[PDB]
C-alpha cells in the first residue's frame, strides 16, 4: 500500500534534498502497488531526548528503514548510537551515511547497521597492498589502543600473515597521554625504518612533536599515516615527506543520500513480491515483539545492492561496511598536500608527479640497517669459558 522510510538528517537543506530524492525515486518505477513516502527529523543535542524522539516520531509510522548522518557542528558529541540501539531493538535495519568508527562493524552489539563508507581498517588493507609495490619488508607498527588501534592492528596482522611474514615490535600507548619519549626512544634503536601510525588527531600531533625532538624525522626514514592523522592538524606539526590517505568523496552528503535512497527503494520493491510480509510495529510502547520479517529484509538489503549511481558501484560485504572504495594517496611538499597516486581496488596506480621523502632525498629509501653490533651471551663453565 503505502510504505514510509524515516531518516535522521543534519540540517534543513539536506532534509529537502532527501525529500526530492525520494520523490525522484517514486518518479522512477511506480506502477501502482508501492508509493514509498518519506519521513524525516533533525538531529538533537543530548541523547535521551534524541532516543525518545526517534522512538515516538519515527516508529509511530511503521518505517521500513532509517537513515542517519554525522552531526553538523560537533565531531563525536552526537554519534548515531541511540538510533542504532532503539531501531535494532525491533530489528528494523538502518543505514549509516558518513560515520566511520569500526565499532559498528561487529554485529554482536549493533544488530542491524550497515554503512556505505569503509570504516578504518581498510586503510590497513591499503597499507599492506602499497607495502609490496615499493618492496620494503620490515615495519614497526606504532598504534594507539582503545578500540580503533586494536582493530587496525588485528586487521593488518591477519593480512600480513598470508605471505608468512611477521611484523617487528608492535607497541601501543594509552589514549590521551604525554611524554611518550621513552617508548619512541626504545623504538628508535632497531633494524626497521618504515613506521606505520594509527592514532587520533591530538595523539598524532604529540607523536610528531616527540619524534621531531628526537630527530627521528630525518633522512633515510619513511612514515605512513591514515586519514585522521592528517588534515586535522597537518600544517602545524607534521613532518615533510609523509604519505597519507583520503577517501575521495567522504563528506558529500547529497551523493550518499541519493545512493542510499536508490538502494533502499530497489531492495524494498524486490522484497515486496514475497509471500510472508509483516509490517513493522505501529507504536513504541505496548509492543515488545521482534518484527518477524525484519531479519529477512536485512538479507535482501545486504546481498543485492548494486545500485550503480553517482558514488560508483555499491556492494555491501558480509558484515555491513561497503567494500571496493577508492582512496587517494597524498604527500606533503612544503606544507602542501599534492596528490601522488590513486588506489582503485587490489592495485595502486602511481601518477606523473615525483615524490619527496622525509628529508628531501629524491630516491626510494629502503628500510634496513643490519646493526653489526651484536650482543652475546655466555655462561661460566668448564674449559670452554
Amino acid at each position, epitope marked *: 500500500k503505502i510504505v514510509n522510510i524515516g531518516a535522521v538528517l543534519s540540517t534543513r537543506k539536506h532534509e529537502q534534498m532527501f525529500r526530492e530524492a525520494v520523490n525522484q525515486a517514486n*518518479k522512477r*518505477h511506480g506502477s501502482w502497488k508501492i508509493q514509498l513516502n518519506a519521513t524525516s527529523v533533525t538531529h538533537k543535542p543530548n541523547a535521551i531526548q534524541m532516543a525518545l524522539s526517534v522512538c515516538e516520531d519515527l516508529i509511530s509510522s511503521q518505517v521500513y528503514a532509517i537513515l542517519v548522518s554525522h552531526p553538523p557542528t560537533p565531531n563525536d558529541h552526537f554519534t548515531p548510537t541511540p538510533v542504532s540501539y532503539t531501531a535494532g531493538f525491533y530489528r528494523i535495519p538502518v543505514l549509516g551515511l558518513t560515520t566511520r568508527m569500526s565499532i559498528y562493524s561487529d554485529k554482536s552489539i549493533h544488530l542491524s547497521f550497515l554503512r556505505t563508507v569503509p570504516p578504518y581498517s581498510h586503510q590497513s588493507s591499503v597499507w599492506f597492498e602499497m607495502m609490496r609495490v615499493y618492496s620494503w619488508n620490515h615495519i614497526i607498527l606504532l598504534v594507539s589502543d582503545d578500540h580503533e588501534g586494536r582493530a587496525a592492528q588485528k586487521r593488518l596482522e591477519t593480512l600480513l600473515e598470508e605471505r608468512e611474514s611477521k611484523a617487528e615490535k608492535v607497541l601501543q600507548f594509552d589514549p590521551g597521554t604525554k611524554n611518550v619519549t621513552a617508548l619512541l626512544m626504545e623504538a628508535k634503536e632497531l633494524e626497521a625504518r618504515v613506521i606505520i601510525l594509527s592514532a587520533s588527531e591530538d595523539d598524532a600531533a604529540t607523536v610528531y612533536r616527540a619524534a621531531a625532538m628526537l630527530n627521528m624525522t630525518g633522512s633515510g626514514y619513511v612514515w605512513l599515516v591514515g586519514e585522521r592523522e592528517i588534515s586535522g592538524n597537518a600544517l602545524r606539526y607534521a613532518p615533510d615527506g609523509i604519505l597519507g590517505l583520503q577517501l575521495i568523496n567522504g563528506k558529500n552528503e547529497s551523493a550518499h543520500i541519493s545512493d542510499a535512497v536508490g538502494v533502499v527503494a*530497489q531492495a524494498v520493491h524486490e522484497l515486496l513480491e514475497k509471500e510472508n510480509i509483516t509490517d513493522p510495529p505501529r507504536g513504541c510502547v505496548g509492543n515488545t515483539n521482534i518484527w518477524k520479517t525484519g531479519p529477512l529484509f536485512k538479507r535482501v538489503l545486504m546481498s*543485492s545492492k*548494486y545500485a*550503480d549511481g553517482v558514488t560508483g558501484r555499491v556492494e555491501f560485504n558480509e558484515d555491513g561496511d561497503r567494500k571496493f572504495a577508492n582512496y587517494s594517496i597524498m604527500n606533503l611538499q612544503n606544507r602542501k598536500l599534492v596528490q601522488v597516486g590513486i588506489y582503485n581496488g587490489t592495485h595502486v596506480i602511481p601518477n606523473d608527479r615525483k615524490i619527496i621523502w622525509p628529508g628531501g632525498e629524491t630516491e626510494k629509501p629502503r628500510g634496513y640497517q643490519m646493526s653489526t653490533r651484536l650482543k652475546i651471551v655466555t655462561i661460566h663453565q668448564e674449559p670452554f669459558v
Partner: antibody
Amino acid sequence: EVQLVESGGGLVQPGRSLRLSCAASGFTFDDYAMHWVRQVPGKGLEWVSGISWSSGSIGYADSVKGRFTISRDNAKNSLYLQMNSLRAEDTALYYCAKDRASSWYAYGMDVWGQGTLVTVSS
Amino acid sequence: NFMLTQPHSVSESPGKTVTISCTRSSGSIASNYVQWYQQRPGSSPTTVIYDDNQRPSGVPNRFSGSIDSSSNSASLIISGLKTEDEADYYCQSTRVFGGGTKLTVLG
C-alpha cells in the same frame, strides 16, 4: 567497447520449440541486466521479459505466460531465451536490449543488438 | 493501463525546426518517465533521449525534449537540419510503445 550479438532465430513449423542466444562483448556481464523486446512489421514494439542482475527479480509480458522462459549464464557472458508451443502471430523480429541498472524496474535500455528473424507458418 | 498516441507521420523541409509529441492516455505525464528512441531502416534502433531531457554521450545537441504537461503529453523539438537524419521515431514510458512517426525530408 559495448557490442551486442544475437543468434538462434529462424523459420520452423508450428508446435516446435526454439532457443535464442545473445552474446555480449566488452563491458562487464554480471553488473547489468538485459530485457527482451520484439519488433513487429509495420507496427512498433512490445516488451516480453526481463532478468535481474543475477536472478530472482523476474517479469514477463501479460500475454506470454507459460510459453516463454528466460535465463542467463554469467560464465560465458551469454543469454538464453527458451520457448515452446509457437504460434502464427509472433512471426516478427526479436531484439536484444541491455538496460542501464542492475534491475529491470527502470525499464530503460540502451545499446541494442541487431535483430533476429523468426517466422512460424506452414 | 494506457495507450500513448502520436501522429502517424510528419513532413518537413530542410532548415526548419519541428516538434513531435506523443500523448498519454490516462494518468499524469509527470508521474512517470519518457524516453525517445530512433532507428534507421535496416538498422537496429538506438536511444537518442532518456530521462525527460537528458543527452547521452555522442548526441550532437540539437535534440531537445519538452516535458510540458499541457494536455498530458510530451514532445521533442529538433532544429532546422535535414541531412540523412529523417526516419521513424518512438517514445516509451512504461511497458508501452507507440506506432511511430516518420520524419520525411521534403524533396
